[PDB]
Amino acid sequence: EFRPEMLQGKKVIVTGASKGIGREMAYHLAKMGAHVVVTARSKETLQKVVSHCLELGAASAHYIAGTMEDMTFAEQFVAQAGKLMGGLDMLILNHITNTSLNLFHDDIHHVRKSMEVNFLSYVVLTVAALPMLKQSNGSIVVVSSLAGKVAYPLVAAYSASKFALDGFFSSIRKEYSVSRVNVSITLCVLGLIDTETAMKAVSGIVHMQAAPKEECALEIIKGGALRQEEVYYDSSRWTTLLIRNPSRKILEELYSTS
Amino acid sequence: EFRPEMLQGKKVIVTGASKGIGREMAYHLAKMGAHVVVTARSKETLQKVVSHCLELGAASAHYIAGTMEDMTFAEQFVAQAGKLMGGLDMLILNHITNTSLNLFHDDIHHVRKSMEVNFLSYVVLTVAALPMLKQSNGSIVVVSSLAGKVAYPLVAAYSASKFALDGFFSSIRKEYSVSRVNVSITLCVLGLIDTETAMKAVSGIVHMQAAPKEECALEIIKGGALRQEEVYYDSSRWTTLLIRNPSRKILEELYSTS
Ligand SMILES: NC(=O)c1ccc[n+]([C@@H]2O[C@H](COP(=O)([O-])OP(=O)(O)OC[C@H]3O[C@@H](n4cnc5c(N)ncnc54)[C@H](OP(=O)(O)O)[C@@H]3O)[C@@H](O)[C@H]2O)c1
Ligand SMILES: NC(=O)c1ccc[n+]([C@@H]2O[C@H](COP(=O)([O-])OP(=O)(O)OC[C@H]3O[C@@H](n4cnc5c(N)ncnc54)[C@H](OP(=O)(O)O)[C@@H]3O)[C@@H](O)[C@H]2O)c1
Ligand SMILES: CCc1nc([C@H]2CCCO2)c(C(=O)N[C@@H]2[C@@H]3C[C@@H]4C[C@H]2C[C@@](O)(C4)C3)s1
Ligand SMILES: CCc1nc([C@H]2CCCO2)c(C(=O)N[C@@H]2[C@@H]3C[C@@H]4C[C@H]2C[C@@](O)(C4)C3)s1
Predict the structure, then answer these.
(1) In this UniProt entry, which residues form the Lumenal topological domain(s) (chains A, B)?
(2) B148 CB under 6 A from ligand 2?
């Protein structure tokens, strides 16, 4: 029941939108006629994305350059982006810190930096965005991974940050449901996707089929527009059948009902 | 299968061992004739734990006081504990930052502090302990929560840190399966426990049956001794059945190739 018209004139933020899945989401939103504000560290790459977004038919497109390692940048970013659009309908949280497939050695540094960038910056962005999202009865879209639901070797710091996202965002979704805050939260569980980053990282190490980044970007936007609690997107139909955790839903509902 | 004799003469670190579950674990290990090193911030409270451990029959008992907000203290603590005992067989990670039941609003200070103390310091402690645990084919015991596997309101920052523990420690367990490091990792999934902190925190907010802290503590040591991947301890039989995620283990084992 998704309709591309669900996004026309909507005010959307997309993080990590200079390349990969983030860039594909900005292009999709542009084609749907949304107002977009994209962010990443590369000002030059973001300018090119914003230009193609206006070409594609966006109601408006702007960018704000900076690092999500900086919590002051994150807080101010949401305010600046909201002031540029005159509100906020959907917050798409998609950036991560650069990571590789390697065994955990003595890297507290990569663990701390992955936690600050992949998890804490998302919380700061939410807190900053929530007054406008409350006014619009908007949506928060949190891009995660299969490695955020299940254990795989070579991605320990990454997995920790992605598991932290589920814990945080699913707990506040329960709070919003009980306090009657009509701000939806969509957690996106993605399998391996064919971005230049993933294809380089995975070469000669992993032998899995990667899914198309364009289709993946559209499935995230659909999830958010339909206010779905979770989106599952993987190349395998077998993997997609096993990802759902019905016991967790019963365990949550047992507490919820009583 | 378990025998208390499995802990006799074992060299064990217990963090957050001045009260609650941590103190009860130190007491059980002491009765079992283990060597124990306890930590927490209160030197006066730890002294009383050390005294009673000797009275109970510990092979040796020592305390080191400090805050796990200090990563330098965490590193130095393991090294000092190791010297005190002449090695290390088991590392029990149990401390958390002080937490109360509250709806999340704008407390990034509590989010960051929960991630630093409940998750980051566990990693730091693990890195510092790994050479000794590798040499003794030791064990890492990670105290988590049902809120570290499932979503509940009033504990967002807390849940994120416990979910982060699962992601990190379960990913490293898969890595030890490839490098064949003989260090076991036990994640303990606990329901509400009758500790003084929890009874005061739930008062007038939540109505749930708490399980006993003495049996909780023993159940944790037993899972550590038997090198189990997960320990489940909850007052309900239904919830104990539902905490297992068999789709996750299929998804993980189906990946365990290449
Ligand atoms: N591709 C996959 O296989 C896969 C699988 C599962 C989940 N996912 C998830 O999908 C999302 C995007 O993945 P992707 O492959 O499309 O990534 P990507 O192509 O490498 O893009 C990452 C984006 O984040 C930005 N970024 C990097 N460091 C940053 C920082 N410190 N501050 C702010 N922004 C930063 C990058 O731009 P700058 O370098 O200019 O800052 C870029 O715009 C991530 O959350 C990822 O975990 C991907
Ligand atoms: N009780 C429950 O219902 C329950 C349920 C599920 C899971 N758990 C888990 O079980 C574990 C123990 O819980 P508990 O209820 O027994 O806790 P507790 O009685 O409140 O004890 C917490 C311990 O951590 C220490 N601590 C606090 N802050 C610290 C810091 N900054 N640095 C170092 N140490 C610190 C405390 O002593 P000082 O204040 O002197 O430092 C104390 O020794 C935790 O991991 C908790 O998440 C408990
Ligand atoms: C199929 C299940 C998944 N495994 C991985 C993991 C486990 C094995 C391979 O990837 C996933 C994942 O999220 N990979 C990301 C890609 C590849 C790597 C690691 C992570 C972040 C990246 O930037 C680099 C994009 S999803
Ligand atoms: C059985 C499901 C659980 N709910 C909670 C949650 C949801 C409602 C009650 O606690 C659990 C939990 O881990 N509680 C802890 C107690 C009570 C509070 C919060 C947390 C940390 C404490 O120090 C204070 C001990 S386990």
Answers:
(1) 1-258
(2) no
The one-letter amino acid code at B122 reads Y
Strand intervals (E) in B56-201: 60-65, 90-93, 139-143, 184-190
Q: How far is CA B8 from CA B30, B32, B186, B241, in A?
A: 9, 6, 19, 32
Residue A171's contacts (CB-CB under 8 Å, 6 or more residues apart) are B104, B147, B151, B152, B153, B155, B156, B159, B160
A8, A103, A152, A205, B257 from A107: Cα distances, Å = 45, 10, 17, 20, 25
Give a three-class secondary structure readout of B124-139: HHHHHHHHHHHHHCCE
- Ligand 3 atom with the shortest distance to the CA of A206: 9
Secondary structure class of A179 (helix, strand, coil)? helix
Collapsing DSSP states into helix, strand and coil, what is residue A233? strand
Q: Which residue has its alpha carbon closest to ligand 2 atom 41?
A: B41
Please give the domain boundaries of chain A with CATH numbers for all domains: 1-258 (3.40.50.720)
Contact B15, B92 (CB under 8 A): yes
CB B185, CB B140: distance < 8 Å = yes
Interface of A with B in 23-52 (CB under 8 A): none
Contacts 24+ apart (CB under 8 A), B128-135: B128/B74, B128/B75, B128/B77, B128/B78, B128/B79, B129/B13, B129/B78, B129/B82, B129/B88, B129/B91, B130/B183, B132/B78, B132/B82, B132/B87, B132/B88, B133/B88, B133/B89, B133/B91, B133/B183, B134/B181, B134/B182, B134/B183, B135/B87
**Do B81 and B64 meet the contact criterion of CB atoms below 8 Å apart?**
yes
Amino acid at the residue B109: H
Amino acid at A218: L
Which three-class secondary structure state does DSSP give residue A18?
coil
Across the interface, whether the CB atoms of B250 and A242 are under 8 A apart is answered yes
Letter for the amino acid at B103? L
Residues contacting B172, CB < 8 A, separation 6+: A104, A156, B126, B185
Beta bridge partners of A55: none
∠ CA(B253), CA(B254), CA(B258), 5° rounding? 95
What whole-number distance in Å separates Cα of residue B196 and Cα of residue B194? 7
